[PDB]
Protein backbone atom coordinates (compact mmCIF):
# COMPACT_ATOMS: atom_id res chain seq x y z
CA UNK A 1 0.00 0.00 0.00
CA UNK A 2 2.79 2.38 -1.03
CA UNK A 3 4.31 3.62 -4.29
CA UNK A 4 7.94 2.78 -4.83
CA UNK A 5 9.80 4.28 -7.76
CA UNK A 6 12.49 3.47 -10.12
CA UNK A 7 16.10 4.40 -9.45
CA UNK A 8 16.46 7.16 -12.02
CA UNK A 9 18.06 9.07 -9.16
CA UNK A 10 19.67 8.02 -5.93
CA UNK A 11 17.38 8.57 -2.94
CA UNK A 12 14.37 7.71 -5.10
CA UNK A 13 15.60 4.15 -5.17
CA UNK A 14 14.16 3.46 -1.71
CA UNK A 15 11.75 6.33 -1.14
CA UNK A 16 8.12 5.29 -0.86
CA UNK A 17 4.96 7.39 -0.69
CA UNK A 18 1.60 6.83 0.93
CA UNK A 19 -1.61 5.34 -0.45
CA UNK A 20 -4.14 7.70 -1.99
CA UNK A 21 -6.32 4.95 -3.41
CA UNK A 22 -8.87 6.11 -0.83
CA UNK A 23 -8.75 9.93 -0.71
CA UNK A 24 -11.94 11.25 -2.29
CA UNK A 25 -10.41 12.60 -5.53
CA UNK A 26 -10.16 15.81 -3.56
CA UNK A 27 -7.78 18.68 -2.74
CA UNK A 28 -9.83 21.61 -1.40
CA UNK A 29 -10.77 21.78 2.25
CA UNK A 30 -14.22 23.27 2.70
CA UNK A 31 -12.94 26.58 4.07
CA UNK A 32 -15.71 26.87 6.63
CA UNK A 33 -14.81 27.31 10.30
CA UNK A 34 -12.27 24.58 9.58
CA UNK A 35 -9.01 26.10 8.28
CA UNK A 36 -7.11 28.27 10.75
CA UNK A 37 -3.72 29.98 11.15
CA UNK A 38 -0.30 28.57 12.03
CA UNK A 39 2.95 29.20 13.86
CA UNK A 40 6.53 28.03 14.39
CA UNK A 41 9.12 26.05 16.26
CA UNK A 42 9.97 27.52 19.63
CA UNK A 43 8.20 29.27 22.50
CA UNK A 44 7.14 32.66 23.83
CA UNK A 45 10.56 33.83 24.98
CA UNK A 46 12.20 33.20 21.62
CA UNK A 47 14.26 30.42 23.21
CA UNK A 48 14.29 27.05 21.47
CA UNK A 49 12.36 24.75 23.76
CA UNK A 50 12.23 21.65 21.58
CA UNK A 51 15.35 21.68 19.45
CA UNK A 52 15.85 20.54 15.87
CA UNK A 53 12.53 21.99 14.72
CA UNK A 54 11.47 24.52 12.13
CA UNK A 55 11.41 25.07 8.41
CA UNK A 56 9.23 22.64 6.57
CA UNK A 57 6.15 23.69 4.66
CA UNK A 58 3.17 25.97 4.88
CA UNK A 59 0.41 24.09 6.64
CA UNK A 60 -3.18 25.01 7.43
CA UNK A 61 -4.93 23.55 10.45
CA UNK A 62 -8.10 21.48 10.16
CA UNK A 63 -10.52 21.84 13.06
CA UNK A 64 -10.97 18.22 14.12
CA UNK A 65 -13.84 17.21 16.36
CA UNK A 66 -12.81 15.17 19.36
CA UNK A 67 -15.79 16.31 21.44
CA UNK A 68 -18.35 14.10 19.75
CA UNK A 69 -20.74 14.69 22.64
CA UNK A 70 -22.29 17.89 21.31
CA UNK A 71 -24.04 16.06 18.44
CA UNK A 72 -25.83 13.31 20.35
CA UNK A 73 -28.85 11.73 18.69
CA UNK A 74 -28.18 13.94 15.66
CA UNK A 75 -26.90 11.59 12.95
CA UNK A 76 -24.51 12.47 10.16
CA UNK A 77 -23.26 11.22 6.80
CA UNK A 78 -19.62 10.69 5.89
CA UNK A 79 -19.00 12.91 2.89
CA UNK A 80 -15.33 12.76 1.99
CA UNK A 81 -11.92 11.34 2.94
CA UNK A 82 -9.36 14.14 3.02
CA UNK A 83 -5.67 14.62 3.68
CA UNK A 84 -4.46 16.39 6.79
CA UNK A 85 -0.75 17.26 7.03
CA UNK A 86 -0.93 17.76 10.79
CA UNK A 87 -1.71 14.14 11.67
CA UNK A 88 -0.46 10.73 10.59
CA UNK A 89 -4.04 9.69 9.90
CA UNK A 90 -6.28 11.29 7.34
CA UNK A 91 -9.50 13.13 8.14
CA UNK A 92 -13.13 12.85 7.16
CA UNK A 93 -15.43 15.68 6.19
CA UNK A 94 -18.82 14.44 7.31
CA UNK A 95 -22.22 16.04 6.87
CA UNK A 96 -24.96 16.21 9.49
CA UNK A 97 -28.65 16.13 8.65
CA UNK A 98 -28.74 19.22 10.85
CA UNK A 99 -26.93 20.97 8.03
CA UNK A 100 -23.66 21.21 9.88
CA UNK A 101 -20.30 20.06 8.57
CA UNK A 102 -17.46 18.68 10.66
CA UNK A 103 -14.22 16.69 10.73
CA UNK A 104 -13.24 13.36 12.28
CA UNK A 105 -10.09 11.26 12.17
CA UNK A 106 -10.28 8.66 9.42
CA UNK A 107 -10.73 5.09 10.69
CA UNK A 108 -10.40 1.73 8.96
CA UNK A 109 -12.99 0.33 6.56
CA UNK A 110 -14.75 3.68 6.52
CA UNK A 111 -16.92 4.21 3.46
CA UNK A 112 -18.55 7.29 1.99
CA UNK A 113 -22.24 8.03 2.40
CA UNK A 114 -22.22 5.61 5.32
CA UNK A 115 -24.37 6.70 8.25
CA UNK A 116 -22.40 7.74 11.33
CA UNK A 117 -23.89 8.86 14.63
CA UNK A 118 -22.81 9.85 18.13
CA UNK A 119 -24.75 8.52 21.10
CA UNK A 120 -25.20 5.81 23.72
CA UNK A 121 -27.72 4.07 21.46
CA UNK A 122 -25.58 4.16 18.32
CA UNK A 123 -24.58 0.93 16.55
CA UNK A 124 -21.21 -0.80 16.63
CA UNK A 125 -20.40 -0.19 12.94
CA UNK A 126 -17.10 1.66 12.70
CA UNK A 127 -17.38 5.45 12.82
CA UNK A 128 -19.86 5.90 15.65
CA UNK A 129 -18.86 7.38 18.99
CA UNK A 130 -20.40 6.82 22.40
CA UNK A 131 -19.43 6.22 26.04
CA UNK A 132 -17.44 3.14 26.97
CA UNK A 133 -19.87 1.84 29.59
CA UNK A 134 -21.89 1.04 26.47
CA UNK A 135 -19.23 -0.21 24.06
CA UNK A 136 -18.88 -3.98 24.50
CA UNK A 137 -15.72 -5.87 25.38
CA UNK A 138 -12.97 -6.72 22.89
CA UNK A 139 -13.87 -3.78 20.69
CA UNK A 140 -11.47 -1.82 18.51
CA UNK A 141 -11.89 1.79 19.59
CA UNK A 142 -9.92 5.01 19.31
CA UNK A 143 -10.13 8.68 20.26
CA UNK A 144 -10.76 8.38 23.99
CA UNK A 145 -11.38 11.00 26.63
CA UNK A 146 -9.04 10.34 29.53
CA UNK A 147 -11.45 12.19 31.81
CA UNK A 148 -15.12 12.67 30.92
CA UNK A 149 -15.95 15.57 28.64
CA UNK A 150 -12.46 16.86 27.91
CA UNK A 151 -11.84 15.66 24.36
CA UNK A 152 -10.15 12.70 22.74
CA UNK A 153 -6.69 12.45 24.24
CA UNK A 154 -5.84 8.80 23.50
CA UNK A 155 -5.19 6.61 20.46
CA UNK A 156 -5.52 8.81 17.38
CA UNK A 157 -2.43 8.45 15.20
CA UNK A 158 -2.38 6.33 12.08
CA UNK A 159 -3.30 2.67 12.43
CA UNK A 160 -3.66 2.94 16.18
CA UNK A 161 -6.34 0.95 17.95
CA UNK A 162 -7.38 -0.01 21.45
CA UNK A 163 -9.34 -2.90 22.90
CA UNK A 164 -11.85 -3.01 25.75
CA UNK A 165 -10.90 -5.52 28.41
CA UNK A 166 -13.86 -5.40 30.79
CA UNK A 167 -15.92 -3.18 33.06
CA UNK A 168 -15.35 -2.37 36.72
CA UNK A 169 -17.93 -0.17 38.42
CA UNK A 170 -18.17 3.22 36.77
CA UNK A 171 -14.68 2.62 35.35
CA UNK A 172 -13.43 0.68 32.34
CA UNK A 173 -10.23 -1.17 31.48
CA UNK A 174 -8.36 -0.02 28.39
CA UNK A 175 -5.39 -1.34 26.43
CA UNK A 176 -3.47 1.40 24.72
CA UNK A 177 -1.11 1.09 21.75
CA UNK A 178 1.75 1.48 24.21
CA UNK A 179 0.84 -1.43 26.44
CA UNK A 180 -0.68 0.11 29.53
CA UNK A 181 -3.92 -1.02 31.15
CA UNK A 182 -5.58 2.07 32.59
CA UNK A 183 -8.66 2.80 34.64
CA UNK A 184 -10.78 5.23 32.63
CA UNK A 185 -14.33 6.29 33.39
CA UNK A 186 -17.15 4.63 31.51
CA UNK A 187 -18.70 7.96 30.52
CA UNK A 188 -15.75 9.02 28.36
CA UNK A 189 -16.76 9.25 24.71
CA UNK A 190 -14.76 7.20 22.24
CA UNK A 191 -15.35 6.41 18.59
CA UNK A 192 -15.32 2.88 17.29
CA UNK A 193 -12.79 1.59 14.80
CA UNK A 194 -9.10 1.51 14.06
CA UNK A 195 -7.49 4.61 12.64
CA UNK A 196 -6.68 4.58 8.95
CA UNK A 197 -3.41 4.70 7.07
CA UNK A 198 -1.97 1.74 8.92
CA UNK A 199 0.87 1.88 6.38
CA UNK A 200 2.41 5.15 7.57
CA UNK A 201 5.15 3.29 9.42
CA UNK A 202 5.87 1.41 6.19
CA UNK A 203 6.80 4.54 4.24
CA UNK A 204 10.38 5.59 3.53
CA UNK A 205 11.56 9.19 3.37
CA UNK A 206 14.33 8.23 0.98
CA UNK A 207 16.35 11.42 1.21
CA UNK A 208 17.19 14.38 3.44
CA UNK A 209 14.63 16.98 2.43
CA UNK A 210 11.72 14.80 3.45
CA UNK A 211 13.17 15.23 6.90
CA UNK A 212 13.28 18.99 6.38
CA UNK A 213 9.94 19.17 4.55
CA UNK A 214 8.32 17.81 7.73
CA UNK A 215 9.71 20.37 10.13
CA UNK A 216 12.11 17.84 11.62
CA UNK A 217 15.44 19.57 11.04
CA UNK A 218 18.75 17.67 10.91
CA UNK A 219 19.72 16.10 14.23
CA UNK A 220 23.31 16.64 15.28
CA UNK A 221 24.67 14.03 17.68
CA UNK A 222 26.50 14.53 20.94
CA UNK A 223 29.68 12.64 20.10
CA UNK A 224 30.52 15.51 17.75
CA UNK A 225 29.92 18.33 20.18
CA UNK A 226 32.25 19.91 22.64
CA UNK A 227 31.79 19.45 26.38
CA UNK A 228 30.49 22.99 26.58
CA UNK A 229 27.42 21.75 24.71
CA UNK A 230 27.19 18.01 25.35
CA UNK A 231 28.50 15.61 27.95
CA UNK A 232 29.93 13.28 25.32
CA UNK A 233 32.37 15.90 24.09
CA UNK A 234 34.25 13.40 21.94
CA UNK A 235 37.62 15.10 22.21
CA UNK A 236 40.27 13.16 20.34
CA UNK A 237 38.76 11.17 17.52
CA UNK A 238 35.73 8.97 17.77
CA UNK A 239 36.59 8.40 21.42
CA UNK A 240 33.68 6.85 23.29
CA UNK A 241 30.90 8.10 25.50
CA UNK A 242 33.22 8.32 28.50
CA UNK A 243 30.32 7.05 30.68
CA UNK A 244 27.46 7.07 30.97
CA UNK A 245 25.11 7.61 28.01
CA UNK A 246 23.26 10.82 28.74
CA UNK A 247 21.52 13.93 27.41
CA UNK A 248 22.59 17.53 26.72
CA UNK A 249 21.30 18.54 30.14
CA UNK A 250 22.93 15.66 31.98
CA UNK A 251 20.30 13.07 32.76
CA UNK A 252 21.03 9.63 31.39
CA UNK A 253 18.89 8.35 28.52
CA UNK A 254 19.26 4.60 28.81
CA UNK A 255 16.53 3.45 31.14
CA UNK A 256 15.54 6.22 33.51
CA UNK A 257 11.91 5.83 34.51
CA UNK A 258 11.47 9.61 34.32
CA UNK A 259 7.77 9.26 35.11
CA UNK A 260 6.81 10.80 38.43
CA UNK A 261 6.29 8.33 41.26
CA UNK A 262 4.22 10.32 43.77
CA UNK A 263 1.62 10.88 41.08
CA UNK A 264 -2.15 10.35 41.38
CA UNK A 265 -2.44 8.85 37.91
CA UNK A 266 -0.30 5.89 38.98
CA UNK A 267 -3.28 4.63 40.99
CA UNK A 268 -5.08 3.89 37.72
CA UNK A 269 -2.43 2.00 35.73
CA UNK A 270 -0.81 -1.43 35.50
CA UNK A 271 2.14 -0.52 33.27
CA UNK B 1 -10.12 -20.06 57.03
CA UNK B 2 -12.76 -21.14 59.50
CA UNK B 3 -12.77 -24.10 61.89
CA UNK B 4 -15.16 -26.57 60.26
CA UNK B 5 -15.78 -30.30 60.00
CA UNK B 6 -16.69 -30.89 56.37
CA UNK B 7 -14.06 -30.40 53.73
CA UNK B 8 -12.34 -31.47 50.53
CA UNK B 9 -8.94 -32.96 49.72
CA UNK B 10 -6.58 -32.65 46.75
CA UNK B 11 -3.90 -34.91 45.25
CA UNK B 12 -1.25 -34.12 42.64
CA UNK B 13 1.13 -36.95 41.75
CA UNK B 14 4.07 -36.07 39.54
CA UNK B 15 6.41 -38.72 38.17
CA UNK B 16 8.77 -37.52 40.91
CA UNK B 17 6.56 -36.43 43.83
CA UNK B 18 2.99 -36.44 45.11
CA UNK B 19 2.06 -33.06 46.59
CA UNK B 20 -1.33 -33.23 48.29
CA UNK B 21 -3.52 -30.66 50.00
CA UNK B 22 -6.97 -30.26 51.52
CA UNK B 23 -9.66 -27.62 51.97
CA UNK B 24 -13.38 -27.08 52.54
CA UNK B 25 -16.44 -27.31 50.27
CA UNK B 26 -15.68 -23.68 49.41
CA UNK B 27 -12.04 -23.37 48.34
CA UNK B 28 -10.20 -21.88 51.29
CA UNK B 29 -7.34 -24.31 52.02
CA UNK B 30 -5.95 -25.10 55.46
CA UNK B 31 -3.28 -27.78 55.17
CA UNK B 32 -1.02 -29.56 52.72
CA UNK B 33 1.75 -32.14 52.72
CA UNK B 34 4.27 -33.63 50.32
CA UNK B 35 6.93 -36.29 49.99
CA UNK B 36 9.30 -33.64 51.27
CA UNK B 37 7.22 -32.38 54.16
CA UNK B 38 7.09 -35.96 55.38
CA UNK B 39 10.87 -35.70 55.35
CA UNK B 40 12.15 -37.45 52.26
CA UNK B 41 14.05 -35.73 49.46
CA UNK B 42 15.32 -36.41 45.94
CA UNK B 43 13.91 -39.20 43.79
CA UNK B 44 12.55 -40.62 47.03
CA UNK B 45 9.88 -37.93 46.65
CA UNK B 46 8.26 -40.01 43.90
CA UNK B 47 8.26 -43.25 45.86
CA UNK B 48 4.61 -44.19 46.52
CA UNK B 49 5.61 -45.08 50.08
CA UNK B 50 6.64 -41.48 50.63
CA UNK B 51 3.43 -40.41 48.92
CA UNK B 52 1.50 -42.69 51.26
CA UNK B 53 3.20 -40.90 54.14
CA UNK B 54 2.31 -37.47 52.78
CA UNK B 55 -1.46 -37.90 53.11
CA UNK B 56 -0.86 -38.85 56.74
CA UNK B 57 0.53 -35.41 57.57
CA UNK B 58 -2.48 -34.03 55.71
CA UNK B 59 -4.81 -36.42 57.52
CA UNK B 60 -3.73 -34.88 60.83
CA UNK B 61 -3.89 -31.09 60.92
CA UNK B 62 -7.30 -31.30 59.29
CA UNK B 63 -8.45 -33.28 62.32
CA UNK B 64 -6.51 -30.68 64.31
CA UNK B 65 -9.32 -28.36 63.24
CA UNK B 66 -12.12 -30.88 63.71
CA UNK B 67 -12.93 -32.50 60.38
CA UNK B 68 -15.15 -35.55 59.97
CA UNK B 69 -15.66 -36.56 56.34
CA UNK B 70 -13.88 -35.07 53.32
CA UNK B 71 -13.89 -35.27 49.53
CA UNK B 72 -11.07 -36.52 47.30
CA UNK B 73 -10.31 -34.92 43.91
CA UNK B 74 -7.26 -36.56 42.39
CA UNK B 75 -5.18 -34.90 39.69
CA UNK B 76 -2.28 -36.79 38.16
CA UNK B 77 -1.02 -40.07 36.79
CA UNK B 78 2.06 -41.11 38.76
CA UNK B 79 2.59 -43.84 41.30
CA UNK B 80 1.65 -41.96 44.46
CA UNK B 81 -1.89 -42.21 43.11
CA UNK B 82 -3.66 -44.94 45.07
CA UNK B 83 -1.10 -44.83 47.87
CA UNK B 84 -2.69 -41.58 48.99
CA UNK B 85 -6.24 -42.75 48.31
CA UNK B 86 -5.83 -45.96 50.28
CA UNK B 87 -4.03 -43.77 52.79
CA UNK B 88 -7.01 -41.41 52.68
CA UNK B 89 -9.79 -43.96 52.25
CA UNK B 90 -8.51 -45.35 55.59
CA UNK B 91 -7.24 -42.68 57.97
CA UNK B 92 -10.14 -41.31 59.97
CA UNK B 93 -11.92 -39.05 57.50
CA UNK B 94 -14.50 -40.83 55.37
CA UNK B 95 -14.80 -39.89 51.72
CA UNK B 96 -17.79 -38.90 49.59
CA UNK B 97 -16.27 -38.57 46.09
CA UNK B 98 -13.35 -40.29 44.37
CA UNK B 99 -13.14 -37.69 41.64
CA UNK B 100 -10.46 -37.52 38.95
CA UNK B 101 -9.78 -34.26 37.12
CA UNK B 102 -6.43 -35.23 35.63
CA UNK B 103 -5.62 -32.51 33.08
CA UNK B 104 -6.01 -34.15 29.66
CA UNK B 105 -5.84 -31.71 26.74
CA UNK B 106 -7.00 -32.00 23.16
CA UNK B 107 -3.53 -31.77 21.61
CA UNK B 108 -3.07 -28.04 21.99
CA UNK B 109 0.18 -27.25 23.78
CA UNK B 110 3.22 -28.88 22.19
CA UNK B 111 5.36 -30.54 24.86
CA UNK B 112 9.10 -30.74 25.51
CA UNK B 113 11.21 -33.42 23.85
CA UNK B 114 9.90 -35.93 26.41
CA UNK C 1 -23.50 -20.68 -8.29
CA UNK C 2 -24.75 -22.46 -11.40
CA UNK C 3 -28.51 -22.71 -11.78
CA UNK C 4 -30.58 -24.60 -14.31
CA UNK C 5 -31.53 -21.39 -16.12
CA UNK C 6 -27.81 -20.79 -16.56
CA UNK C 7 -27.69 -24.05 -18.54
CA UNK C 8 -30.59 -24.26 -21.00
CA UNK C 9 -30.49 -20.51 -21.65
CA UNK C 10 -27.08 -21.15 -23.14
CA UNK C 11 -28.03 -24.53 -24.58
CA UNK C 12 -31.07 -23.45 -26.58
CA UNK C 13 -28.95 -20.52 -27.71
CA UNK C 14 -26.49 -23.01 -29.18
CA UNK C 15 -28.34 -26.31 -29.59
CA UNK C 16 -27.70 -26.36 -33.33
CA UNK C 17 -30.81 -28.45 -33.62
CA UNK C 18 -33.32 -28.80 -30.77
CA UNK C 19 -32.60 -31.73 -28.48
CA UNK C 20 -28.87 -30.99 -28.72
CA UNK C 21 -27.70 -30.96 -25.12
CA UNK C 22 -24.03 -31.50 -25.91
CA UNK C 23 -22.17 -30.82 -29.14
CA UNK C 24 -18.72 -29.38 -29.78
CA UNK C 25 -20.44 -26.05 -30.33
CA UNK C 26 -22.43 -26.47 -27.12
CA UNK C 27 -19.65 -28.10 -25.11
CA UNK C 28 -17.36 -25.11 -25.59
CA UNK C 29 -20.08 -22.57 -24.85
CA UNK C 30 -20.85 -24.62 -21.74
CA UNK C 31 -17.24 -24.72 -20.57
CA UNK C 32 -16.69 -21.12 -21.65
CA UNK C 33 -19.40 -20.16 -19.18
CA UNK C 34 -17.64 -21.87 -16.28
CA UNK C 35 -14.23 -20.54 -17.35
CA UNK C 36 -15.52 -16.98 -17.57
CA UNK C 37 -17.35 -17.67 -14.32
CA UNK C 38 -14.48 -19.53 -12.64
CA UNK C 39 -11.81 -17.03 -13.59
CA UNK C 40 -13.62 -14.30 -11.67
CA UNK C 41 -13.45 -16.69 -8.76
CA UNK C 42 -9.67 -16.99 -8.80
CA UNK C 43 -9.59 -13.19 -8.94
CA UNK C 44 -10.50 -12.80 -5.27
CA UNK C 45 -9.30 -16.18 -3.98
CA UNK C 46 -5.99 -15.68 -5.71
CA UNK C 47 -4.39 -18.25 -3.40
CA UNK C 48 -6.65 -21.17 -4.36
CA UNK C 49 -3.97 -22.79 -6.48
CA UNK C 50 -5.97 -26.00 -6.10
CA UNK C 51 -8.85 -24.74 -8.24
CA UNK C 52 -6.51 -23.02 -10.67
CA UNK C 53 -5.43 -26.40 -12.02
CA UNK C 54 -8.85 -27.58 -13.15
CA UNK C 55 -9.25 -24.37 -15.11
CA UNK C 56 -6.21 -25.20 -17.23
CA UNK C 57 -7.83 -28.58 -17.69
CA UNK C 58 -11.14 -26.89 -18.48
CA UNK C 59 -9.37 -24.38 -20.71
CA UNK C 60 -7.09 -26.93 -22.34
CA UNK C 61 -10.06 -29.22 -22.77
CA UNK C 62 -11.79 -26.41 -24.64
CA UNK C 63 -8.47 -25.96 -26.45
CA UNK C 64 -9.15 -29.24 -28.24
CA UNK C 65 -12.72 -29.04 -29.53
CA UNK C 66 -12.03 -25.74 -31.26
CA UNK C 67 -9.11 -27.62 -32.81
CA UNK C 68 -11.72 -30.15 -33.97
CA UNK C 69 -14.15 -27.60 -35.39
CA UNK C 70 -11.45 -25.52 -37.09
CA UNK C 71 -10.12 -28.82 -38.44
CA UNK C 72 -13.41 -30.22 -39.73
CA UNK C 73 -15.53 -27.15 -40.45
CA UNK C 74 -13.88 -23.75 -40.78
CA UNK C 75 -17.27 -22.15 -41.22
CA UNK C 76 -18.62 -22.85 -37.74
CA UNK C 77 -15.40 -21.75 -36.01
CA UNK C 78 -15.01 -17.96 -36.07
CA UNK C 79 -18.78 -17.86 -36.53
CA UNK C 80 -18.71 -19.15 -32.94
CA UNK C 81 -15.67 -17.11 -31.90
CA UNK C 82 -17.47 -13.90 -32.82
CA UNK C 83 -20.45 -14.93 -30.69
CA UNK C 84 -18.44 -15.16 -27.47
CA UNK C 85 -15.15 -13.46 -28.35
CA UNK C 86 -12.62 -16.22 -27.78
CA UNK C 87 -8.88 -16.77 -28.16
CA UNK C 88 -6.63 -13.73 -28.60
Amino acid sequence: AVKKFKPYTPSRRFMTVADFSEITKTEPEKSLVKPLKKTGGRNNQGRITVRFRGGGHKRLYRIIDFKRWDKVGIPAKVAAIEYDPNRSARIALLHYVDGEKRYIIAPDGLQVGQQVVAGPDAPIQVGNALPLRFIPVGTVVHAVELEPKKGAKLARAAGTSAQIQGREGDYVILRLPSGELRKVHGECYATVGAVGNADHKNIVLGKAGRSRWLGRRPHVRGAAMNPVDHPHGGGEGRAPRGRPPASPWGWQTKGLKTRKRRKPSSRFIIA
Amino acid sequence: KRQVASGRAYIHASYNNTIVTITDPDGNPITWSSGGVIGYKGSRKGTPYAAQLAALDAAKKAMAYGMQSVDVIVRGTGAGREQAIRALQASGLQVKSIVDDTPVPHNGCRPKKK
Amino acid sequence: PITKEEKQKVIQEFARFPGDTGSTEVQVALLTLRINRLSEHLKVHKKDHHSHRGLLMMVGQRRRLLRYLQREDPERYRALIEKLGIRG
Partner: protein, 70 residues
Amino acid sequence: KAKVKATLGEFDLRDYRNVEVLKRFLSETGKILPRRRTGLSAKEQRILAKTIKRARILGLLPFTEKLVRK
Protein backbone atom coordinates in the same frame (compact mmCIF):
# COMPACT_ATOMS: atom_id res chain seq x y z
CA LYS D 1 -22.00 -55.74 28.02
CA ALA D 2 -23.60 -55.36 24.59
CA LYS D 3 -23.95 -52.20 22.51
CA VAL D 4 -26.63 -49.67 21.54
CA LYS D 5 -27.63 -48.84 17.94
CA ALA D 6 -30.66 -51.12 17.77
CA THR D 7 -31.50 -50.09 21.34
CA LEU D 8 -33.00 -46.91 19.90
CA GLY D 9 -35.78 -46.66 17.36
CA GLU D 10 -36.28 -44.30 14.45
CA PHE D 11 -34.00 -41.47 15.56
CA ASP D 12 -32.72 -38.76 13.24
CA LEU D 13 -28.98 -39.03 13.73
CA ARG D 14 -28.78 -35.74 11.82
CA ASP D 15 -30.87 -34.24 14.64
CA TYR D 16 -28.38 -32.34 16.80
CA ARG D 17 -30.88 -31.95 19.63
CA ASN D 18 -32.49 -35.22 20.76
CA VAL D 19 -29.88 -35.41 23.50
CA GLU D 20 -31.76 -38.20 25.27
CA VAL D 21 -30.92 -40.21 22.14
CA LEU D 22 -27.25 -39.36 22.55
CA LYS D 23 -26.17 -39.19 26.21
CA ARG D 24 -25.53 -42.93 25.91
CA PHE D 25 -23.18 -42.32 22.99
CA LEU D 26 -20.76 -40.56 25.31
CA SER D 27 -19.24 -43.11 27.70
CA GLU D 28 -19.09 -42.18 31.38
CA THR D 29 -17.00 -39.08 30.59
CA GLY D 30 -18.12 -37.57 27.25
CA LYS D 31 -15.80 -39.38 24.86
CA ILE D 32 -17.82 -40.63 21.91
CA LEU D 33 -18.11 -44.38 22.03
CA PRO D 34 -16.34 -45.91 19.02
CA ARG D 35 -17.97 -47.75 16.13
CA ARG D 36 -16.79 -50.91 17.88
CA ARG D 37 -19.27 -50.03 20.66
CA THR D 38 -22.23 -48.54 18.74
CA GLY D 39 -22.74 -51.15 16.01
CA LEU D 40 -22.83 -48.28 13.54
CA SER D 41 -21.50 -48.33 10.00
CA ALA D 42 -18.86 -46.13 8.41
CA LYS D 43 -21.14 -43.45 6.98
CA GLU D 44 -23.40 -43.83 10.01
CA GLN D 45 -20.73 -42.73 12.48
CA ARG D 46 -19.43 -39.81 10.41
CA ILE D 47 -22.88 -38.28 10.14
CA LEU D 48 -23.26 -38.80 13.88
CA ALA D 49 -20.14 -37.11 15.22
CA LYS D 50 -20.85 -34.13 12.99
CA THR D 51 -24.06 -33.79 14.98
CA ILE D 52 -22.51 -34.87 18.28
CA LYS D 53 -19.93 -32.13 17.84
CA ARG D 54 -22.74 -29.80 16.72
CA ALA D 55 -24.90 -30.68 19.71
CA ARG D 56 -21.82 -30.25 21.86
CA ILE D 57 -21.69 -26.60 20.83
CA LEU D 58 -25.22 -25.54 21.81
CA GLY D 59 -24.43 -26.34 25.46
CA LEU D 60 -26.28 -29.65 25.43
CA LEU D 61 -23.47 -32.14 25.59
CA PRO D 62 -20.25 -32.17 27.61
CA PHE D 63 -16.62 -32.82 26.73
CA THR D 64 -15.25 -34.21 30.00
CA GLU D 65 -17.54 -35.43 32.72
CA LYS D 66 -15.33 -36.01 35.73
CA LEU D 67 -14.45 -39.65 36.36
CA VAL D 68 -16.03 -41.04 39.52
CA ARG D 69 -14.85 -44.35 41.04
CA LYS D 70 -11.99 -45.94 39.08
